[PDB]
Amino acid sequence: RLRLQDIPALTQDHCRMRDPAEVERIINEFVIGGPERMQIVSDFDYTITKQRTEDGGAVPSSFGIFNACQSLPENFKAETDKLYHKYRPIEIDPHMPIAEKVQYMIEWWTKSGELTSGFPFDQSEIDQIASKYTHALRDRTHEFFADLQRLGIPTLVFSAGLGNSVVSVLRQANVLHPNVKVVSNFLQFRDGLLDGFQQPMIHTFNKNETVLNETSEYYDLVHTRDHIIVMGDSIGDADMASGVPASSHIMKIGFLFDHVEANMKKYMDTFDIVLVDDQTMDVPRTLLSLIEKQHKLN
Numbered sequence: 001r002l003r004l005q006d007i008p009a010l011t012q013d014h015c016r017m018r019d020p021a022e023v024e025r026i027i028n029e030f031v032i033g034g035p036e037r038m039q040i041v042s043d044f045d046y047t048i049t050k051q052r053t054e055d056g057g058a059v060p061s062s063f064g065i066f067n068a069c070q071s072l073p074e075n076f077k078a079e080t081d082k083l084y085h086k087y088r089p090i091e092i093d094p095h096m097p098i099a100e101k102v103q104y105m106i107e108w109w110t111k112s113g114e115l116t117s118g119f120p121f122d123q124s125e126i127d128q129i130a131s132k133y134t135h136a137l138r139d140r141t142h143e144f145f146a147d148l149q150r151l152g153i154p155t156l157v158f159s160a161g162l163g164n165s166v167v168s169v170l171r172q173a174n175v176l177h178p179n180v181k182v183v184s185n186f187l188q189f190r191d192g193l194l195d196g197f198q199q200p201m202i203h204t205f206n207k208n209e210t211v212l213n214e215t216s217e218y219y220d221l222v223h224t225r226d227h228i229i230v231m232g233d234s235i236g237d238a239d240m241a242s243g244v245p246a247s248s249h250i251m252k253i254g255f256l257f258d259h260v261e262a263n264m265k266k267y268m269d270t271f272d273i274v275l276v277d278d279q280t281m282d283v284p285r286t287l288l289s290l291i292e293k294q295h296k297l298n
């Protein structure tokens with residue numbers, strides 16, 4: 001019974017939709033269903049953090065947060081810079097198929113894990129770096145996660161980055177509530193020393209059923225959660241929830257900032273909602289608020 005023209009955040013100029021009718025229908029499904037059937041799957045880097053800071057200030061990735069620590073050997077930032085310079089162009093190569101990218105991404109993550117080995121490391125360094133960027137989350141992220149917790153909605157942060165940094169940022173932002181789980185590449189510690197990352201490897205091209213599916217540990221938390229909101233700033237992010245078999249309705253929300261017109265067609269074909277230069281969580285928040293309205297009514 002909800003109409004799109006009565007939902008202000010969806011009517012704004014930056015909100016692009018290939019098919020507003022299907023979006024409206026999905027929203028109505030969400031609200032009929034209630035919070036108890038809702039689940040969230042969100043990318044971290046430049047989805048939860050800002051692509052454009054209100055200030056001119058730059059925001060580093062999770063890996064960027066790690067690599068900026070002092071406890072690192074003096075060779076580390078050099079070697080990681082070399083690796084990045086090598087594999088980053090490949091990661092964002094439009095012409096290259098994903099089935100060709102995967103090998104090279106495997107190379108990147110492998111070499112990186114092997115780089116981060118043999119020296120001890122303290123979480124508090126990470127924390128010290130991460131505390132400077134709690135102010136760089138999208139506007140109303142705190143309120144968004146507050147909503148999620150209050151509604152008891154399982155929220156997954158699915159990241160191909162460095163989980164320690166992610167968790168540090170989220171914790172220090174006072175946003176990592178009991179309902180929030182993080183699946184990412186986490187540091188592995190052996191006998192007081194680093195030993196790469198803990199299996200399984202999560203790269204940019206397996207943020208999907210190959211990693212998150214019915215066999216996964218997290219599935220038991222959300223096997224009753226058939227209404228999914230997926231949030232991301234990259235095309236790949238759109239398939240993060242492909243491994244949930246009995247999902248009936250999925251709202252795919254994509255945040256477009258870089259190369260707006262070039263990527264607009266792809267993003268519109270990929271996401272149900274495309275948000276252009278939107279550094280807030282006001283749209284997902286809107287959805288949740290409708291769902292909660294219906295919840296109180298019942």
Ligand SMILES: Nc1ccn([C@@H]2O[C@H](CO)[C@@H](O)[C@H]2O)c(=O)n1
Binds near residue numbers: 061062084088160161
């Ligand atoms: N060892 C690695 C592996 C990946 N990356 C970059 O971080 C992004 C995930 O947050 C990936 O998309 C990738 O660009 C990195 O900086 N260092």
Ligand SMILES: [Cl-]
Binds near residue numbers: 045158
């Ligand atoms: Cl990622």
Ligand SMILES: [Mg+2]
Binds near residue numbers: 044046
């Ligand atoms: Mg991202």
